[PDB]
Design goal:
The chain has 372 residues and is mainly alpha-helical. The chain contains 14 helices and 6 strands. Bound molecules: ammonium ion. Its main location: cytoplasm.
Length: 372
Amino acid sequence: GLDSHELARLHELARHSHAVITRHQDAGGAYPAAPTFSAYRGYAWLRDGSFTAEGISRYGDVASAGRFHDWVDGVLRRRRGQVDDLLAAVDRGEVPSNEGMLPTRFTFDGNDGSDPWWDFQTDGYGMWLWSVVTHAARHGLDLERWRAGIDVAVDYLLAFWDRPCYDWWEEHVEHRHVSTLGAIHGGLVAVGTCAALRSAPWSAATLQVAARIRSLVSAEGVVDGHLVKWLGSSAVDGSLPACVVPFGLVPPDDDVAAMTRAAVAKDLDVDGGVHRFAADVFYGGGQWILLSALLGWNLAAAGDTAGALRHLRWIADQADADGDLPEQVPHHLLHPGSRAEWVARWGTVATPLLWSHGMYLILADELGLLPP
Ligand SMILES: [N+]
């Protein structure tokens, strides 16, 4: 199994992951993506923050995770009128432009941090529903604390789930991305199957829309037995295992789950470090900590503890002298000639990336390795 040498190092990286996340959590409750990376500093993402919050909730820091959910909830209640206006526009047949949608980046005070024409994404609102329900179930909490923000997110996603948008990586606005569909599905099934939310007006609708998402993925999101990066594509994306665990398009034991884990591993995993997609030129297309953790989580869930452990160890080997985990490492580059221009333009790779730490904690917990 694991010797005292490796257990001590993995425990310390878990302790440090909790510390770096809670040290950089904003006073208002937001988790930032990266406190010192030029292009990300000063902003929060619901994607990063939701997976971060789920690592912290598993770790057992109820107070920290709860302040994140408070933050998100209050940000979303503030958009009640914005969401109602977009729904009324749809009802009039005046479909709003990407420029009018809810944002991707948030400032720590809950304002738009970016222009959605350039980065419109719907996945983070589905990930937040999955996160807050999973947290409340784990710690026995009353979801009425965050219900009015849940209601905004649900209403928005029931309207806009089928809209093309940019993927997790802020690319390809014209497409419908399977890990985006998957994030929405996970959020909708989490609220639709939640006994505390049984009387919500949208209860039945969330499970009917989740079924519509699965129908779309069955028709256009599966090729040669595996999920694909966007509807109508043949290629895989490193984000796709999230459609198994945690978002539940198919269970871990399904043939499409197995075929998707094997395709991601064959096409994108080098020596334990998982690339985003074949064409990735961002910093040369490096190996992403959070994706090695996502694949490891999916292997643990399917009963492949050994494969899970190999990916955990790979991630632990990327910690720097202070125990900080970067976004990505360049040990294998898909497009080595593209790295220099990114380092010149934005600097050295985001380190720490809080989502890297959040995912480390999830995978550690899946393997029973959080300090006792
Ligand atoms: N699991």
